[PDB]
Amino acid sequence: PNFSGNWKIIRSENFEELLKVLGVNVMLRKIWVAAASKPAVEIKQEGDTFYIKVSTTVWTTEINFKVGEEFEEQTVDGRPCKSLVKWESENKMVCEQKLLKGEGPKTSWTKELTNDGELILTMTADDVVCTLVFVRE
Numbered sequence: 001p002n003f004s005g006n007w008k009i010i011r012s013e014n015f016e017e018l019l020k021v022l023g024v025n026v027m028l029r030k031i032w033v034a035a036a037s038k039p040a041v042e043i044k045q046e047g048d049t050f051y052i053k054v055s056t057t058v059w060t061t062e063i064n065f066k067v068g069e070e071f072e073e074q075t076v077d078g079r080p081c082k083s084l085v086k087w088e089s090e091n092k093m094v095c096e097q098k099l100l101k102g103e104g105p106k107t108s109w110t111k112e113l114t115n116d117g118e119l120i121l122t123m124t125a126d127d128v129v130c131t132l133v134f135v136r137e
């Protein structure tokens with residue numbers, strides 16, 4: 001349906017846990033989830049094609065994909081990867097990520113629109129699941 005919107009975050013869960021598995025050391029994680037961990041997500045959708053903009057106060061990243069087509073992006077912690085999004089339901093999609101170079105935790109993310117107006121991102125590294133919940137602006 002209409003994933004498109006200007007999304008403001010309302011709930012974070014396990015974001016520091018995620019960062020830990022990803023290997024960001026302690027002081028870095030703590031300091032990280034501080035004044036720059038309340039992110040804005042902008043979504044413009046046209047069919048199976050997605051344009052996404054995620055930004056803090058000094059950083060912004062653009063993610064562009066079509067469902068079913070490989071692309072390149074970033075892991076949550078900054079490492080470049082190849083990604084592929086699939087649908088798992090009418091309102092939910094799943095992305096498997098494979099690192100470009102190196103090794104590290106197995107990462108993935110999902111994007112779901114609840115019928116109640118919540119946009120729900122999850123990000124997974126090995127067995128830790130960070131859940132972010134947004135509502136529109």
Ligand SMILES: *C/C=C(C)/C=C/C=C(C)/C=C/C1=C(C)CCCC1(C)C
Pocket residue numbers: 036037039041052054056063075076109111121
């Ligand atoms: C469909 C929505 C997607 C793919 C959203 C992805 C969001 C991120 C990869 C967020 C990354 C973040 C940073 C790069 C630093 C600030 C903390 C986060 C989680 C907002």
